[PDB]
Amino acid sequence: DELYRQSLEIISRYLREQATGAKDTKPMGRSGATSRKALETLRRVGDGVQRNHETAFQGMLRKLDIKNEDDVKSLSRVMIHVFSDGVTNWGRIVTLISFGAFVAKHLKTINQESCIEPLAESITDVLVRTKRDWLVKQRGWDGFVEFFHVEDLEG
Ligand SMILES: CN1CC/C=C/[C@H](OCCN2CC(F)(F)C2)[C@@H]2CC[C@H]2CN2C[C@@]3(CCCc4cc(Cl)ccc43)COc3ccc(cc32)[C@@](O)(C(=O)NS(=O)(=O)N(C)C)CC1=O
């Protein structure tokens, strides 16, 4: 399952990078060039979403009351409720992943770093396993990179 593997790698790296503040130096697996550009895109676009919606992000986190492994496990049900049961577009996918990074940073601050990788698997599961058809039709991560591509300015 190339799409799942690639999705997991991108999502995991972003969540880990966000939580630790350090870049992972290990090579990407398959389709490395696209995965690199996807991660760079998430860095640009996800960071903005977290700031543009700072108050709501803090509010949702407080509402979820995330303390440990059991609470982190319960998030899949909530992701299905909120994300899967709605329209699909790249903006909503970025918000899914960006709030994931927001949760990962919370896990770091409460010294629950070990829950970050399971969280990343949970997000990947919801995204790929409920929206595969849409993702394929939109050209997957290549489509993601193309969608958010910014032209160089003249002059
Ligand atoms: C306009 N926006 C961004 C702003 C919305 C912020 C939202 O808060 C609204 C105000 N609430 C927070 C409160 F304090 F409880 C009062 C939530 C902050 C995270 C937003 C909820 N989640 C986050 C969520 C759901 C919660 C659990 C979760 C966990 C992980 Cl690890 C990752 C993602 C998620 C599913 O992913 C989302 C995808 C798309 C949208 C919203 C998603 C959205 O696509 C979406 O559908 N949001 S919404 O259902 O709440 N509604 C505003 C349309 C995001 C969107 O439209």
Curated annotation (Swiss-Prot):
Belongs to the Bcl-2 family. A motif (BH2) lies at residues 133-148. Changing K37R: No effect on ubiquitination. Interacts with HIF3A (via C-terminus domain). Interacts with BAD, BOK, BIK and BMF. Interacts with PMAIP1. Interacts with BBC3. Isoform 1 interacts with BAX, BAK1 and TPT1. Heterodimer of isoform 1 and isoform 2. Homodimers of isoform 1 or isoform 2 are not detected. Isoform 2 does not interact with pro-apoptotic BCL2-related proteins. Interacts with RTL10/BOP. Interacts with BCL2L11; may sequester BCL2L11 to prevent its pro-apoptotic activity. Interacts with GIMAP5 and HSPA8/HSC70; the interaction between HSPA8 and MCL1 is impaired in the absence of GIMAP5. A motif (BH1) lies at residues 81-101. Involved in the regulation of apoptosis versus cell survival, and in the maintenance of viability but not of proliferation. Mediates its effects by interactions with a number of other regulators of apoptosis. Isoform 1 inhibits apoptosis. Isoform 2 promotes apoptosis. There is a cross-link at K23, K26 (Glycyl lysine isopeptide (Lys-Gly) (interchain with G-Cter in ubiquitin)). Disulfide bonds: none annotated. This is Induced myeloid leukemia cell differentiation protein Mcl-1. A motif (BH3) lies at residues 38-52. Induction: Expression increases early during phorbol ester-induced differentiation along the monocyte/macrophage pathway in myeloid leukemia cell line ML-1. Rapidly up-regulated by CSF2 in ML-1 cells. Up-regulated by heat shock-induced differentiation. Expression increases early during retinoic acid-induced differentiation. The gene is MCL1. The chain holds residues 172 to 326 of 350 of the full protein. It is found in: Membrane; Cytoplasm; Mitochondrion; Nucleus, Nucleoplasm. Cleaved by CASP3 during apoptosis. Treatment with taxol or okadaic acid induces phosphorylation on additional sites.
